[PDB]
């Protein structure tokens with residue numbers, strides 16, 4: 001039911017972020033690290049973005065310099081449970097702001 005689908009979609013999200021950041025060619029130095037399954041993106045200004053799994057809830061959480069965002073699996077997207085906004089849009093907006101460079105993955 002929910003557990004296996006969570007593992008499937010989260011594993012895919014992890015890969016998509018990892019691949020996109022390894023393939024980062026822009027001017028800014030952006031680093032991505034995985035520690036205890038948690039992804040940490042680090043920017044040149046020392047700021048970070050942290051992405052982790054909340055297994056009980058089947059949610060992916062985002063922590064940015066600006067706030068914390070909790071995402072529900074909904075179809076082919078991750079949806080911010082307060083605002084309805086998508087995971088990629090919010091991750092791009094924060095990454096763009098923290099890198100001071102467009103960080104656009106679509």
Ligand SMILES: [Co+2]
Pocket residue numbers: 002003055056057058
């Ligand atoms: Co469960």
Ligand SMILES: [Co+2]
Pocket residue numbers: 031032033
């Ligand atoms: Co490294």
